[PDB]
Amino acid sequence: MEPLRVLELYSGVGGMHHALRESCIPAQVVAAIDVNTVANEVYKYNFPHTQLLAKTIEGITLEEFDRLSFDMILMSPPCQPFTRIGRTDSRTNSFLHILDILPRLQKLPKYILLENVKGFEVSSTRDLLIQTIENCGFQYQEFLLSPTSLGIPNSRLRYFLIAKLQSEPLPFQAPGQVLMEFPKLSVKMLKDFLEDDTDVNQYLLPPKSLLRYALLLDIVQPTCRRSVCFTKGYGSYIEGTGSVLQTAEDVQVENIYKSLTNLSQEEQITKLLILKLRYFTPKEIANLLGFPPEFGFPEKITVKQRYRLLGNSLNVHVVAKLIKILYE
Amino acid sequence: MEPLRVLELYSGVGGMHHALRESCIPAQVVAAIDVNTVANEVYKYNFPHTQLLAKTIEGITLEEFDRLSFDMILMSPPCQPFQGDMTDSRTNSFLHILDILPRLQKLPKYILLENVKGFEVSSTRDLLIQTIENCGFQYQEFLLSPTSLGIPNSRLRYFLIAKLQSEPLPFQAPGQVLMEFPKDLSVKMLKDFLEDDTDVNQYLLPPKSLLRYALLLDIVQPTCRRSVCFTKGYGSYIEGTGSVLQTAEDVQVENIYKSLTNLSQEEQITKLLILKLRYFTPKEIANLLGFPPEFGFPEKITVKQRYRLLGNSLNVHVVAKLIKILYE
Ligand SMILES: CCc1ccc(C(=O)NCC2(C(=O)N[C@@H](CC(=O)NCC(=O)NC)Cc3c[nH]c4ccccc34)CC2)cc1
Ligand SMILES: CCc1ccc(C(=O)NCC2(C(=O)N[C@@H](CC(=O)NCC(=O)NC)Cc3c[nH]c4ccccc34)CC2)cc1
């Protein structure tokens, strides 16, 4: 009788929208707003029947906002575009316009849920945002949660703020506190998130990369229940970007390591290849991020862009549970 | 106990040597080893009477390690700004260290290593631990940030302290990485780490960058008792590299935020300059890192080079306490 109209800011590749669906709450995306042409392509490919406003948030007038009549705002960080080799940030103005439009709306949205990076919870920008929603009478709670809490073998500590237009306090509210756990199963293995049709070749680490960074790598095996944070650089830079997968069981990493001693560069390359280390594929990162099994990219989107498009994405599973918590 | 001869691997700017002096333990550095020309100039400038071997660790033979007759190994991550021979020396150096340890005529009694967080779950750590266990060392790993000693800087790093002895360490937690020092410390303000000589200009934030990233910034005031991790990119890349300092006072950050609303680019740029945001100086970062007041660079070192040389540096104060804990 009362389906929620949802506004998705910085829709990117549609992580929020996907979280909306997994929450199984009565809602629908009335509008997606993002200027990234490559991201929007990914968005249409997975959400063809959803309106996508390819505009900056600052360029969307209050009249348009009132017309959309949204009851829920969902926003996650903007996709970091591969700058055209020749080589603008509307973020400050877009964020200010959001703060400026909210009090002037004809219908305040009942729900607000924002996902940002860790560290935001101490910024001056947070204090101004919190200040505005308090003036508008939102009861809120901030979180810092990693998908490991929901049993996903992937570290991705991110910031969350859930806001609800109600006078009463929230049942789980810790005033002035960032909660580190969901309000009151285990960590699955990585093999559950691996695509079995993936070309193991092509994704195998190149030999010169193995030679230089072999012992600086974080090598995980498929039975491992852990993996490090993925950044936009995965697949192009090797240090600090993510874990790599050893697709050659019954070979012990520490044995390859010790046997490299007193070997030539060529013999080490030959030895390290035995481990059959490979990158996680873009689709496999999306699995760990919680994108639905049906999620995919247009073929025109390069592998490099796919890693980049996912590097800054939210975790659909973590956001989906908070949506449920927020909706009761 | 008689005077301890200390070996400093990947000396860099000499954080390990500065920590040894702050430990106030009977020891001196008989050999500093690093191949970075820039870093070694800084090392010579501060420690002119210390032997500095500008060679790769893999290149130092066993007899020369035996002839050095060291009782303590201190190793810190290489300066990592990234020698004619084309060869990454990291792998062969680390494996060379492991292959030399058992073959030494004198095992060092003390071993202290500092590394980045995340190392404690690597296959490399496992091979390292295995080797020191088989050599008879008693060890304990830590993950400590300078805030545990009252320093207003976040910088979680990995530490391994090893000691050649039969008895276990009084604080030894087998199979655990301790997050506190084994059992004044009130976190001090950033005032006590700033330099009065510092030209507030020169380091002031430029207008172009203060317009794109103004609200993406972690702006800290001198009365604050906190700051984020500094990285090599600081002073060049704004986002994620470190906090920026607000020198103009009695001005409240959030007001300047709201006043950017509906203003033009040039009009916004003008309101933000009021905040008088400057970078932390390379020296000021060294103060937060714990380098002694006497620590300085040669003038020929560019400010850009000074920033990179400190990005991956250890914290002298935290290491110094562990050196004491180890010597007992
Ligand atoms: C140093 C720590 C810090 C401080 C501030 C911010 C931030 O966000 N200041 C607002 C901003 C924006 O437009 N922010 C964007 C997101 C963004 O840029 N994240 C950083 C990033 O991806 N860097 C590569 C919109 C947004 C999405 N979820 C949110 C939840 C709450 C408030 C705002 C948001 C004008 C610049 C971030 C980090
Ligand atoms: C992903 C997690 C991870 C895994 C491995 C390592 C590492 O260390 N693999 C050894 C090695 C090296 O050369 N290690 C260097 C340190 C280094 O490069 N750290 C990474 C960095 O600074 N990234 C910006 C020397 C060193 C100093 N303290 C130590 C304590 C124990 C063992 C080794 C060391 C190739 C031979 C680091 C992190």
Residue numbers in the entry:
A (entry chain B): 1 to 87, 92 to 188, 248 to 391
B (entry chain A): 1 to 82, 88 to 188, 247 to 391
Extract from the study:
For our crystallographic studies, we used a deletion construct of human DNMT2, dubbed DNMT2Δ47, in which residues 191 to 237 were deleted since this region is predicted as intrinsically disordered. The asymmetric unit contains two very similar DNMT2Δ47-compound 3 complexes with an overall rmsd(Cα) of 0.354 Å and the largest differences in the loop region comprising residues 82 to 95. We could show that DNMT2Δ47 with bound compound 3 is indeed dimeric in solution at a high protein concentration of 10 mg/mL, which was also used for crystallization. Most interestingly, compound 3 is bound in a largely hydrophobic pocket adjacent to the active site. The indole ring of compound 3 is located in a hydrophobic cave formed by Y10, M75, backbone of S76, P77, F99, L118, F124, and L133. Additionally, the amine group of the indole ring forms a hydrogen bond with the backbone carbonyl of E119. The amide group, which connects the ethylbenzene and cyclopropane moieties, is in van der Waals contact with P78 and R95 and forms three hydrogen bonds, namely with the main chain carbonyl of L278B, with the side chain of N120, and an intramolecular H-bond to the amino group connecting the cyclopropane and indole moieties. The largest local movement upon binding of compound 3 is observed in the loop following β4 (M75 to P78), where P77 and P78 are rotated and shifted toward the SAH binding site. Moreover, the active site residue C79 is now resolved and moved into the SAH binding region. The superposition depicted in Figure 4D shows that binding of compound 3 narrows the active site, which prohibits SAH binding due to steric hindrance by P77, P78, and C79. As a consequence, compound 3 acts as an allosteric inhibitor by reshaping the active site.
DNMT2 (TRDMT1) is a human RNA methyltransferase implicated in various disease processes. Instead of DNA, which is the main target of DNMT1 and DNMT3, DNMT2 introduces the m5C38 modification in several tRNAs. Physiologically, DNMT2 targets various tRNAs, including tRNAGly, tRNAVal, and tRNAAsp.9,12 tRNA methylation by DNMT2 plays a role in regulating RNA degradation by ribonucleases, thereby enhancing tRNA stability and overall protein expression. Additionally, tRNA m5C38 methylation improves codon recognition, particularly distinguishing between aspartate and glutamate, thus enhancing translational accuracy.
